[PDB]
Every structure is written in structure tokens, then in C-alpha cells.
Assembly symmetry: C3
Homo-oligomer: 196 residues x 3
């Protein structure tokens, strides 16, 4: 996981288990750093995006004071999709596809189910878990699974342009809103750890 400060308060993190814990530590390093004001998680051009390790990562991404942007160019499946659901703004290319196929794979979907209900409501979460169908970018956008869609070439610069706009806001204002607005969400993730 190669992080790289591009200035203007932006931190671009270009992409398991060790990769989990590395990302959990990098998010805390970025949260403690005064110079950083916005994080961007990029899967790469066309590329894809125990209990305690996964919960620590989900709760970290959602609990840090700084906002996180997930730039999705291809597929975002299960755990990968779940990480993006901990981010404040999911920007997808018109080619992006979202899948939560846990039931078909034969595993429980407690994290996926909770996280999807938060971003898209019970109906969409239920449609996704029970059918295991793929959500194309435009359906994902309409359902609240994506905040915005762009053409694949524009994806990374639109993400950095938004990170810049966010970085240009009074740090205190943003950083005192984000952990408080995400407290109910983080609490819900914590209950899932215990029940499993």
C-alpha cells in the first residue's frame, strides 16, 4: 500500500490480513498528521477496490476526523465494497460494478447488510444480499451506493479536485462534524463484532 502526499492537504493511497492492518495503521498515521486534510483511496485504472482485524479497519476508516474519498474504477466486491462503504464519498466510473455475493459464496453478511442499509436503505440491501446481482454504476448512483459517477479517464482527477475542495475547508469545521456524524455508524459496526 503506497501512500503519497500530493500537497494541498491530500493523501493518495493507491492499493489480505497484513494489507488490512497496514491500511488500519496508515489511516491513523494520516489522522495524526496536521498537514493532511483529506484522504483518497484509489483502486487503480480498471482494477478491483479475523473478526477483530476487519472491524478495526472498518471502525478506523469511519472514526477518523478527516474525510475519505473512495475512487472506484472497476469491481467493488464483499470486503472491498464494505471498505468503500466506510468512506464519506464514493466516486465511481461509468464502468464501476458493485456486488455483495456473501450468501452465494456461503458465508454470513452481517457487515455487508448493516453497511448497505446505512448507504442505500433496507430495500437495496435486501435486493443485493438475497439476489447477489451486480449493481452497475448508474443503478448504484440512483440507490445511493455511489455519491457521483464520472467517465473512467476523469476518475482520478475528479477525486483529487474534490479532495482539494474538501482540503480548502476550515479543518476544524470538517474534523469536528465527521466523527460525530459517523458515531451511530461506528457503534453499529462495534455491535457486529460482539454478535459474531
Amino acid at each position: 500500500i503506497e501512500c503519497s502526499r500530493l500537497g494541498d492537504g491530500i493523501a493518495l493511497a493507491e492499493f489480505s490480513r497484513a494489507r488490512m492492518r497496514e491500511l488500519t495503521a496508515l489511516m491513523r498515521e494520516l489522522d495524526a498528521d496536521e498537514k493532511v486534510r483529506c484522504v483518497v483511496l484509489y483502486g487503480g485504472a480498471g482494477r478491483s477496490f479475523w473478526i477483530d482485524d476487519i472491524t478495526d479497519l472498518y471502525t478506523t476508516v469511519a472514526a477518523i476526523s478527516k474525510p475519505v474519498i473512495a475512487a472506484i474504477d472497476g469491481y467493488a466486491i464483499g470486503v472491498g465494497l464494505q471498505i468503500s462503504l466506510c468512506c464519506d464519498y464514493r466516486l465511481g466510473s461509468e464502468q464501476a460494478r458493485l456486488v455483495m455475493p456473501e450468501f452465494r459464496v456461503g458465508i454470513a453478511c452481517n457487515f455487508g447488510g448493516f453497511m448497505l442499509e446505512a448507504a442505500a436503505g433496507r430495500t437495496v440491501m435486501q435486493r443485493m444480499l438475497l439476489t447477489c446481482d451486480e449493481w452497475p454504476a448508474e443503478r448504484a448512483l440512483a440507490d445511493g451506493l455511489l455519491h457521483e459517477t464520472v467517465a473512467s479517464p476523469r476518475l482520478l482527477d475528479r477525486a483529487l479536485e474534490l479532495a482539494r475542495t474538501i482540503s480548502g475547508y476550515t479543518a476544524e469545521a470538517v474534523q469536528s462534524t465527521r466523527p460525530r456524524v459517523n458515531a451511530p455508524f461506528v457503534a453499529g459496526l462495534e455491535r457486529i463484532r460482539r454478535e459474531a
Copy 2:
């Protein structure tokens, strides 16, 4: 009332012939179905082109026990709607994991027009379709045709009337095919906040009606 095994792990529950004995029987059936390990999916069906589905204090207790059981059982429940789903009828469907509507399906919450309270309706519509749709439904008492109900999240899917039960059983077959432990360790945990919400309404709904 009448339940039937379709033998893929599918139990089709049908509304025969809303009273308090009807609620208790449905509640007991839901509990019998959660107990039987040969059952992996439940399909609630109104019929062919038919509508879906001190003295007051006992009505509320049976209603609450029905809504809490339908939402708290470990088995997924599919509601198949071929006509009108009004008040209590619509409320039962809002406890199920998947609402499949025919293009003849019409959804209404006319409680206010009828002159009765809508504590449960208000809570359940908010959970399924969001606050705005809930408020539009309660205050206008307008009907929600199938296409509009789908857009707003009141239906998970729409189909043509001749394929309604076919699609219901095809989807029930898909759900039944998943590892039961995977589905059954998810359905009751994911629904716990919704079940807790329904439990708080019990005392509130009593005062209101």
C-alpha cells in the same frame, strides 16, 4: 392460515377465506416455520388477483407480536402482492425481506382518511422507503401504483401478473439454495434494530388508537 411445502425448502403460506385470531395463527405459523429445519425460505401470498392479507389494547399486542415475529425469525420471508396492500395488509408486507409486486399491485396507508392512528405505518414506511415517502403516503392517503412503489423502495421488484407466483418461487428457490447457516445467522441480526423499533411502538400505538 394454510401453509404448504413446495419441497425445495419452500413453504408457501396463503391467506384463506383482519381479526385477532388470524394474527395469532400467522404468528404461530411463523414460529413453526422458524423451528422446522427442512424450511429455508417462506413465501407469503395473497392469492390470484386478490388483496394482500381494552378491546384495542389486545388488538395492538397481537399486531406487535405478529410484526415482531415476521421480522425476528431466522428464515427470509417473501411477500407476493397481486392486488391492493392497505393498512395492516401493507404493514405485514413491510416486515418481509422481499416484496414482489404484480403491475396490478396498489399500496395505500389511508389510516388518516379512515380516522385512525398510524404509529406502525409511520415507523414501517420510514424503514422501507424513507421519511419523505412515508410522509407523502400518510398525509395524502394516495395510492402507490407498482412502478412508483418500486422507485420509492416499497417493492423490491415488479413483474407482470401472469408471472408473479413463478418469480416468487424462482426467487424462493435461489434463497433456499444458499447455505442455510449463512442466511439464518444474518437475517435476525440485520433485522434487530427494526424489531426493537416495533417493540417501542407497542405502548405508543395503544394510547393513539
Copy 3:
């Protein structure tokens, strides 16, 4: 400020800390009035809609949402920050094609804890994140598609439509409506009270 009866139990209300207290008091007066069955908050044709500031802002938000009478917000222009937040406490937001919704607290340089909660309760987490982080304007049709507006009408029939609906709401048995509204709104009211404490608790 200016309140008016239109008959059929309809109360049309038209409109700093003192202005917040005046609206809170009016809402309580209308709740106690047996002749009032529906309230219409109107910004007017073509117009817009420290620890003690928190208290008066919470008292207003919780009063608009906790009263037994339904409140319709008629929006003919801009609804920014506090103005947007007031309408988010109302049960029915009716906008004209010239209604524009903005939550630009971050661009202005201030926290958006009330805005964040209220936007999430009304239109979901995603819409909330779009509005807070971009600080963009939501025109009438985009707000309708996102659940920020319940309905859109052409501005010539905006007040007409708000009254048409107020009459429909008023025509219902009052006890059915008035015993439902504070109950359905209690989780929303509880959330606002949590934020009042957490806002004071942080300063």
C-alpha cells in the same frame, strides 16, 4: 412572525435568536389552539425560507418536529443552512421550480452537526454527504429526486397547492393525526436533543 387563519383550521405562518424564539412560541400557541389542524410555513412569493444559541436553535427544531399539528413548508426560493434545517423539521416540503436547497456550512467555515443529522434523517447518509462535502445547490427537480422535497409545482400555484394539501390534512379526524405525528417524530426529536448535549459537551 405574521400568522393568519384561512378557515378550515388552517394556520398560515409567514417569515437571529429573537426571531427563533418568536417562531418557537408561535408553534406552541398553534399546538394549544383547538381550531388549528394544519400549519403552513411560507417564506413568501419569490423569497428565501454560544451555548444559548444552541439552546434556541434546538428549542425551535424540536418544537417544529414535536408539536401535534402537521407542518407544511412552502419553499419559493433559497433554503440555506438554518433555513433549510427548519424545513427539514416539517412533515411536507413543497417547493416551486425556483426552490434551491443548500447546506454550505463547510464553505462558510462552521461545523454542520445539526445539518448532518437532519439531512441524513430526511434523505439518507449519501445525499447528506453529497450536500455537506460539495456545498453545491440542489435545484427543485434534483431535490425531489433525492427526497429533500416532497413535491414540486410551478410557482403560480405554489401557495394554492400548499392550501389544497392543508385542507386535505385538516379534513382528517384530528385525534388520529395529532396522536400520530409526535410519536412518528420522537426518534428524530431524540436525535436533535442528543446533538444539543454533544454540541455543548464539545465546547
